[PDB]
Structures are given as C-alpha cells and as structure tokens.
Paper text:
We expressed the S. cerevisiae Gea2 with an N-terminal 6xHis-tag in E. coli and purified the protein with a Co-NTA affinity column followed by size exclusion chromatography. We employed mass photometry to reveal that Gea2 predominantly exists as a dimer in vitro. We determined the cryo-EM structure of the Gea2 dimer at an overall resolution of 3.7 Å. The three HDS domains (HDS-1, HDS-2, and HDS-3) were partially mobile and had weaker densities in the consensus refined EM map. We next performed masked local refinement, resulting in improved EM densities in these regions. We found the structure of Gea2 alone is almost identical to Gea2 in complex with Arl1. Gea2 dimerization is primarily driven by hydrophobic interactions at the core DCB region involving Phe-171, Leu-167 and Val-209. Beyond the hydrophobic dimer interface core and at the edges of the dimer interface, electrostatic interaction dominates at the N-terminus of the DCB domain. Indeed, the homodimer of Gea2 is globally asymmetric due to the conformational difference between the two arms of HDS domains. Interestingly, the Gea2 heel-like motif is highly dynamic in solution; it is invisible in the Gea2 alone structure and becomes visible only in the Arl1–Gea2 complex.
Arl1 is an Arf-like (Arl) GTP-binding protein that interacts with the guanine nucleotide exchange factor Gea2 to recruit the golgin Imh1 to the Golgi. Here we report high-resolution cryo-EM structures of the full-length Gea2 and the Arl1–Gea2 complex. Interestingly, Gea2 is predominantly composed of α-helical repeats, with six domains arranged almost linearly from N- to C-terminus, except for the catalytic Sec7 domain that rides above the HUS domain. Gea2 is a highly elongated and crescent-shaped molecule, and two Gea2 molecules dimerize via the DCB and HUS domains to perhaps confer stability and structural rigidity.
Residue numbers in the entry:
A (entry chain A): 175 to 259, 321 to 440, 454 to 874, 887 to 990, 1004 to 1064
B (entry chain B): 7 to 30, 70 to 259
Write the structure that this text describes.
C-alpha cells in the first residue's frame, strides 16, 4: 500500500531496496506458507511494475557520451529472510533500478544454480519479463540496465536453454527470450544469432518434450515479429562475419515439416513448422500487394548488400586463409573485392571493422611485426579515446586484441598505445592536483608515464584475478610501486583509487580466452562480450533496418531468400498435401501453393513456376500417361439433362483433392498475365487435360461460338457415347444411384471451374505455343477405342 | 503501453493451451481460435475486448476444471489487468471489465488439497481488490459491485477457511468500503427540499454462504 502511493514514490533508494530484499525473501523462502508466498509474489510484481513505471519518466543522462563497462555483477546478494520470529537519501532513480536488476540477475545467475530453488529462478525470470514488457525501448536508452540485460541475463538464458531438464524453468526462459527478441531485438543481434544457432543445433538432434516446447515458443516468435525471416536475412545473412540465421532457420523448418521428421519427435511439431512455412509464403505475398511487376523488371541495379552476400563463401575461404597465415591471407584478400587497396589505412580499417570472424590471437601475432608495427600505429590511430582515465583506454585497446606472450611484442603494443593516447588527447597546462575528481581537465600524464601506468595496470590485473597466486596486491603496495611516475611526480590519490577499484571489481575482458574443453560456454560468451557491452555507443536510430528500405529493395531481399529456399518449401508443401487427409489442411495447403505460384510468376522463376504447376497437374490424377468401363450417358424421362457416367467421371467425383487441385489450377491459369512463363511439359499437360475433359464429362464443343455463327455452321458434332441409355424411371444395370450423384457432383465442380474462360480467353494464353501444341496433339488413327470421338 | 499487447495476449493463450494439453475441449478450441485471430492482426483496435477476455472468463467460471488450470487463468487475467491491456481506448471496455468482475464473483473449481484452494482464492481476492480500487472498478455497475461485496464478505466471515485468507478478505473489504464511501463523497446530493419517510424495509439483505471454491 505504501509503495503504490505518492508517499511511496517519495521514499529513498536504500529504503526501497530494503523493501525489495524483504519482500523477495518472504516470496522465495520455503517452509513459510503458500498463501503468504503467493501474496508476497503478487506484491513484488506490483512493486516491480511501479519501479519501472517510475523509470519510464526519468530523462537519460549523458546521451552523447560513450560508456565503458566497469561495474561488477556480483555486488547484490539476496540476504536470508529474518523478518519476524546519485546515492541514498534521494528520491528513487537509476541506482535503485540498477540494484534491483542486479539482484534479479543474482537470482537467475548460472553460477548460483545450487544455492537457489527452481521456483525462485522462475519467479526471477517472470519479474525480468514484466520489467521488459513495461519498459522496452526506454529501458534500452539507459546504458547500465541495457548492459545487465545484454551480457549476463542473456548469458543465463542461453545457459538455461542449453543445460536444463525441468522444462518449467525452460518455459520461463524461452518466454523471456521471445520477449527480448520481440521488444529489443534490433540491439541484441549477436546474442540472438548465438541463441538461435544453439536452438537449431539442439532441435535437429534429450526428450521430445523439450523440442516441442522449443519449437512452440520459437513459433510464437516469428508470427508476431514484424515481417520475420526477412529482417533476419537482412541483418545476418547479408551482413557478413556472421551465420545465415534466416536461411538455416528455414532449412531446419523444412526438414522438420515432413512426417518422417514427425517420427522421433513430438507429433505437434510438424503443424508448427507448416505454419511457419505458410507464414513465410504469406509474408512474401503480402509484400506484393501493389508492386506493378513491370516496374520491378525495369530495375537494373542490384543491391550491393546482396552482391556481397553472394560473395560470402569466398569471404569465408579468405578468412580461413588469413587465420592459417597472414602473409598468404593478405594477398588473397587484396586480390578480391574485400580489401580496398594495399594502403595501410584500408588494412587497418578492415582489421578494425570485422573483429568477429578473424582470429584475434592471430591478429595479435601478425601485428607485432615491424611493417605491421607501422600498420599498428595507423590502427591505433584509428581508435577513439577522448580521455577514459587510462584504464578504460586499456579496456578499449584489449577489447579487440590478444596480447602476445613474449614481452617484446607487449612493449611494442604498449608504446604504440602510449603514442596514440597522447595523439588522441590534447593535454593542457592546468594539471590540477588533488581536490579535482575529473579526468579531462586534470590527469594528463606523458608517453612514458602512461606506458608505466599501463604496464602496472596489466600487472595488477594478472596478479589480482588469478586464484593460483597466494595473497594479493594492496592499494599501498601498488601506489608505492608506481612512485616515480608522470612528470617525475606521483599520480593523484583519487586517480589511483579509481583505477584500483575499477580493475578490482571487474576483470579485463580479452578475446581468445582458452583453447580446449570444460569451459566452452564461458569461452563462447567471452568472445561475445569482447565485441559489445564493453562499449555501448547509442546511435539513437529510429528503428531496425527494415523500415529504412524502399519497397523495391524489400521485394529484392524477398526474391533472394526465395531463390535460396524455394524448391525445398514447394517440395515439402506438395509432400504434406499428398499426405494430408483433412479438408481444412488441404484447402490451406492448396491456397499456399497458389500463393507460391503467384510469387514465382512475379519474379520470373520459370523453373520453380513450371515445377509447381506440373506438380499440381500430376497430382490431379487426370492426365496420367501410364478394367475398361464404357461411359454411360444418362437422359431422364423428364427435365432433360446430360450425365455421362465414365471412368474419369467417377474418379473425379470421388476425389476431394482432385477437384480442389483442378479448381486451383484453372484459377492460377486465369490469373496469369504472361505467356512466356509456362513450359513445354506445362502446355502439354493443359492441352491434354482439356482434351480428356472434352472426351467426356462437361466440355461442350461450343467454345468460341462467334466464329461458328460468322460462317453459319451448325453446332459441332457431340462426341458419341460408348453405352448410352435413356431412363424412364425419372435392366442391364450398369449405373448406380450413388455413382449417378457422384457424376453429377463432378459435373457441378467442372462447370464451376469455368474452363473455357480459364484456358482460352485470357488475352495472353493465346500464343504460338498453345496452338502449336494443340495441333501436335491431334489424332490421325481410326482405332475403335478412339473412333468414338475421332472425327 | 507501446509494447504490442497482442503479443502478451498470444503468449498467455499459448501458455494456457499448453497447460490444458499437458493436463489432458471447447475451451481449448476457443483458445486456439483466439490465437489464430490475434496472430493475423497488428494492433488491438476494431476488435472488442470482450472477445479477448471471453475464453479466460469462461474457463474461470466453469466448475468442472482442475484448480491448476483456473489458477493459471487467473494469473493470466491479473497480468492482463496490471499491464492495462484493456484500456479506455478499447471497444466495450465497460462490458469487458464488468464481465471479468462477474466471472470472478461466481468463480468455481475443483481439485487438490486445501492449500491449492487457499492459493487460488487468494488470487481471486487480490484481483477483485486490484480492479475495484482502480478507475475501471469505479466504472462498474450497482449489482456487480454488490455481488463483489457479498462474495468477499462471505469469504471473510466463513470460519471453515484458513486464517491468512480471512485476513486478506478483511483487508480487501476495508479497502472496498473506503472506496465506496469515498465515491459517495462526490455524488451530488438527492433532493434537499422534499421530506423523506422511512417506509423502506430495514431487513431484506441476508449474507449468503460462501460459494466460490469446491
């Protein structure tokens, strides 16, 4: 009651932190109660809602500044329940929300698995999910909370996904992951790539229940994320130095859609995969609302992003060559379009940009060379420091470098760092002594001064973050060691205090941490955190790259992804349509096939379009190439009609899939706008289906009667029937009432298929090929089996 | 707010559907239908909130379901409320909230031992307090709020329950009384000239027995 009131909002950070501690201790302590625990959980949920709502109305601080991650992640611990039996003294703000997020992380920490129960971890994940769903982008604006979400919370999420079996923790973890990807997906690209790769790996090889839950949550991911698979394609497949997340995702979905994949997997997965594929097709179709395909054809240039995306395989080959040996890799990179020129500026730019798919230790070993020492001077000139209190400069330098073991190369690295630090910061003669806590106008060492300070910093890190070294290093000893420093003077007390504390409660992050096993997950996440979340420069972009793309380029990306993943999708769609048995699933499948035909016709994919149409024709089971039931024409004694009872008649009347595919096929033919899209097999199939539908059933030879009336010729001779009877019941007993009504149903379907306007009158289907095939498919022989209609 | 509430709705729908499937028919069908309808959507406009809440309210009101399922349903309802999924900018929000409160009032279930019953009843009472003490609860109806008073007071006075549940019911009753008379402070007074005669009967309303539960 207090917290959810203005009086609560006028409290202090320490008080509200103690409130959080006590309420959460009551909520997540066994042996207390159940009703009391639920009340405490609801109270904690409400308090979190209020806290982050208050966070929503606080302006950001230092928007233009660059943040160097230095705060520790193990400063808050949930103290044991004992109730019964800026700075503090302010009015809330960022300190309380930061400490609350830190405590929540301590709840779900991957190194605290043995110290907390599963209900506590699920509750912590739920609290984090509520906080995210309340704050979102406004939370993304602030740097420390975004760091605590990027590195450690997502590390915990990935660890839980990889190494859990309770499935109740897994459900909460997957829900939080989906919430993160939906809300703050555009700023957590690397984490999403890693998590999705792990999920695909686990899903393609543990009980089936885990895979079912994984696929269900990831399914709820793609439906609601705006225009999925194409944002993923753009951000990952076309960005290089990453993995083809979208293409691999679609390939795994196609591999998991067949019933052969329904085996040794939960049977509810295949419908989910089919929904995903249908969603991709529908998204592509919706992207073609009003595009005027002529305009698409008029386009000449291709997006340079796609051009580089087509060059990715040779990029991987060049990267492997570079990792093997730089003296051979560099000529290979400069031969192709990756490296602009042999100028060291371009080489430094490349070595700075793509520090994700380049062996960092190999980079360090290469860069120690003399010519590579000149390259190193240019490369560190490429950096940007603007102060950073020396230690943050060291962190920046070591983010994308593995220091070689030998001391000579370390000396070269540190001296180049000193020179670049001097160059990138213009010192001033102020040089204020104590009683000056800032670093811009005050601390101003020299080249050898910062050299000594940086060597001391490295020594302090390697001495204070190794458990195998007895004792530690104190502030007094370190300060005494750094006597005889800048300007032959000593550093200020505040400066050394800050440096010592910063290197104390944070280990310097370095890439290529280990090589082996038993720490593979820690190594992977270290090579992730080394890239981001140590530097968080907010670009304040309006949205993801999706919105800043013109509709033509969006359609181009759709065309590329379809070119990659089309044949597989259409193959699995036809497979499941053949297997399918239910009415609704078959109708949805054939609608998806119709949309696929439309999309193939839009992008002028002749092979795919003819493949899908020919598959429809062969599934029609009406144009097969390679017992005999004579056809019977039915005329009543009243209300004269025509009911031809033939083999194909009953075969069609007892084929739901047959009629569905016929009507869809002729609808597709109706929609067509180009004649030079079909194939010879396609034209043969359509001419044959129309001919066999003319032999019997309902295709009257009244097509284009205007010409017949022009020459005053009579109606065409109707093909004779094999066994024609006239009924007086309104004998030899050939027809049956149910087969009669089945033939009537087939007649109704065929007359509803509007064949005449579908095939002939479309102003485009009338081309040389159609009439040429019509003439070639003629008959010139007088056998009895065909004399019934030969003339 | 600004957090695409349709995503929260679909998450709760898939959660409840998965729970029912694991525990194991019209309720699951309604959840699936709502799932599809919301999936083919982009915001919450042009669709009445009563349709969104109807499966959840129906699964709350039904008597022959397990306590775990209705507990999950009530948790989903409270998450819907606390995130303001249904607001003043939604169709039939008056009807939606009135239906939610009506379904809560006549809640029933069956299942496990007294601890689970106490937990689900506590969730019910918390949701009723959260909704009445809010503006939306102020925009309820006379009969609905009278029924809320009847149910909460009956639960409080019943001696066959636990102690914590009775304390929670007492606290909620005090809060609801405070809210009712605080609203009474704002109503424009009735005729101050005509003389009133106390012909209205003094005893017609008798507290009913507890009905929510097994």
């Amino acid at each position: 009651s207090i917290v959810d009131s203005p009086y609560g909002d006028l409290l202090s950070n320490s008080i509200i932190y103690d409130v959080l501690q006590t309420i959460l201790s009551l909520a997540c302590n066994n042996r207390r109660s159940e009703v009391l625990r639920n009340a405490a959980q609801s109270t904690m949920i409400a308090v979190t809602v209020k806290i982050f709502s208050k966070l929503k109305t606080i302006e950001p601080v230092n928007v233009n500044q660059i943040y160097i991650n230095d705060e520790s992640y193990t400063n808050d611990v949930l103290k044991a329940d004992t109730i019964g039996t800026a700075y503090a003294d302010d009015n809330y703000g960022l300190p309380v929300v930061r400490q609350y997020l830190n405590l929540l992380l301590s709840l779900i920490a991957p190194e605290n698995e043995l110290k907390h129960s599963y209900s506590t971890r699920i509750f912590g994940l739920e609290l984090i999910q509520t906080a995210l769903e309340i704050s979102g982008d406004r939370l993304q604006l602030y740097p420390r909370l975004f760091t605590l979400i990027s590195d450690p919370i997502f590390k915990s999420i990935l660890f839980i996904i990889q190494n859990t079996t309770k499935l109740s923790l897994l459900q909460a973890t997957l829900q939080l992951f989906t919430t993160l990807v939906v809300i703050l997906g555009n700023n957590l690209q690397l984490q999403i790539e890693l998590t999705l790769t792990r999920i695909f790996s686990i899903l393609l090889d543990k009980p089936s229940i885990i895979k079912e839950l994984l696929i269900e949550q990831i399914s709820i991911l793609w439906t609601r994320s705006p225009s999925f698979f194409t944002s993923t394609f753009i951000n990952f497949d076309c960005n290089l130095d990453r993995a083809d997340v979208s293409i691999n995702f679609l390939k795994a979905l196609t591999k998991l859609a067949l019933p052969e994949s329904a085996l040794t997997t939960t049977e509810s997965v295949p419908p989910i995969c089919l929904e995903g594929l249908v969603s991709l097709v529908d998204d592509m179709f919706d992207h073609m609302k009003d595009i005027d395909r002529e305009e698409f054809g008029r386009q000449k240039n291709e997006m340079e992003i796609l051009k580089k995306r087509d060059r990715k395989t040779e990029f991987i080959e060049c990267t492997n060559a570079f990792n093997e040996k730089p003296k051979k890799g560099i000529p290979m990179l400069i031969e192709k379009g990756f490296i602009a020129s042999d100028s060291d500026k371009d080489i430094a730019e490349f070595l700075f940009n793509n520090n994700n798919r380049m062996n960092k230790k190999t980079i360090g070993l290469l860069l120690c060379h003399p010519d590579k020492v000149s390259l190193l001077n240019e490369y560190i000139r490429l950096f940007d420091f603007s102060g950073l209190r020396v230690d943050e400069a060291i962190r920046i330098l070591l983010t994308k470098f593995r220091l070689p073991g030998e001391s000579q190369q370390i000396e070269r690295i540190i001296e180049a760092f000193s020179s670049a630090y001097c160059e990138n910061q213009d010192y001033d003669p102020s040089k204020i002594s104590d009683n000056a806590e800032d670093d811009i106008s005050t601390v101003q060492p020299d080249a050898d001064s910062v050299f000594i300070l940086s060597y001391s910093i490295i020594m302090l890190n390697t001495d204070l973050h190794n458990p195998q070294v007895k004792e530690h290093m104190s502030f007094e000893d370190y300060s005494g060691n750094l006597k005889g420093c800048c300007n032959h003077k000593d550093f200020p007390f505040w400066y050394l205090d800050r440096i010592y504390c910063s290197i104390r409660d944070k280990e310097i992050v370095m890439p290529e941490e280990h090589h082996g096993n038993e720490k593979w997950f820690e190594d992977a996440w270290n090579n992730l955190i080394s890239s981001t979340t140590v530097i968080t420069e907010i670009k304040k972009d309006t949205q993801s790259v999706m919105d800043k793309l013109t509709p033509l380029e969006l359609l181009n990306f759709d065309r590329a992804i379809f070119k990659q993943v089309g044949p597989s999708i259409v193959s699995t769609l036809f497979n499941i349509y053949v297997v399918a048995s239910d009415d609704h699933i078959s109708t949805r499948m054939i609608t998806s096939l119709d949309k696929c035909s439309y999309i193939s016709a839009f992008f002028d994919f002749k092979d795919l379009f003819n493949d899908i149409l020919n598959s429809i024709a062969k599934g029609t089971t009406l144009i097969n190439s390679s017992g005999p039931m004579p056809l019977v024409q039915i005329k009543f004694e009243d209300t004269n009609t025509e009911i031809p009872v033939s083999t194909d008649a009953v075969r069609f009347g007892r084929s739901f899939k047959g009629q569905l595919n016929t009507v869809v096929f002729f609808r597709i033919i109706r929609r067509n706008k180009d004649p030079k899209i079909f194939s010879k097999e396609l034209w043969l199939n359509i001419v044959n289906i129309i001919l066999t539908l003319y032999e019997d059933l309902i295709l009257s030879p009244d097509i284009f009667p205007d010409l017949q009336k022009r020459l005053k010729l009579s109606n065409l001779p109707k093909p004779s029937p094999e066994i024609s009877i006239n009924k007086s019941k309104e004998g030899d007993e050939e027809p049956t009432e149910e087969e009669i009504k089945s033939s009537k149903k087939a007649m109704e379907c065929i007359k509803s298929s509007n064949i005449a306007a579908s095939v002939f009158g479309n102003e485009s289907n009338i081309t040389a090929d159609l009439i040429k095939t019509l003439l070639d498919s003629a008959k010139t022989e007088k056998n009895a089996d065909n004399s019934r209609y030969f003339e | 707010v600004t957090v695409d509430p349709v995503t929260i709705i679909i998450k709760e729908c898939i959660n409840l559907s998965t729970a029912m499937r694991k525990y194991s028919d019209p309720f699951l069908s309604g959840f699936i239908q709502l799932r599809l309808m919301l999936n083919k959507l982009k915001n919450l406009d042009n669709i009445d909130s009563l349709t969104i809440l109807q499966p959840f309210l129906l699964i709350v009101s039904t008597s022959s379901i397990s306590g775990y399922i209705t507990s999950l349903a009530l948790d989903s309802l409270q998450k819907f409320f606390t995130l303001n999924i249904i607001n003043e900018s939604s169709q039939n929000y008056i009807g939606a909230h009135r239906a939610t409160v009506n379904a809560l009032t006549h809640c029933r279930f069956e299942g496990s031992q007294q601890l689970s019953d106490d937990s689900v009843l506590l969730k019910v009472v918390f949701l009723l307090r959260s909704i009445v003490d809010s503006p939306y609860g102020d925009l309820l109806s006379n009969s609905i709020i009278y029924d809320v008073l009847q149910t909460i007071l009956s639960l409080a006075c019943n001696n066959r329950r636990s102690e914590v549940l009775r304390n929670a019911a007492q606290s909620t009753m005090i809060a609801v009384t405070v809210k009712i008379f605080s609203k009474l402070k704002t109503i424009e007074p009735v005729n101050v000239n005509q003389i009133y005669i106390n012909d209205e009967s003094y005893t017609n309303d008798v507290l009913k027995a507890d009905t929510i539960g097994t």
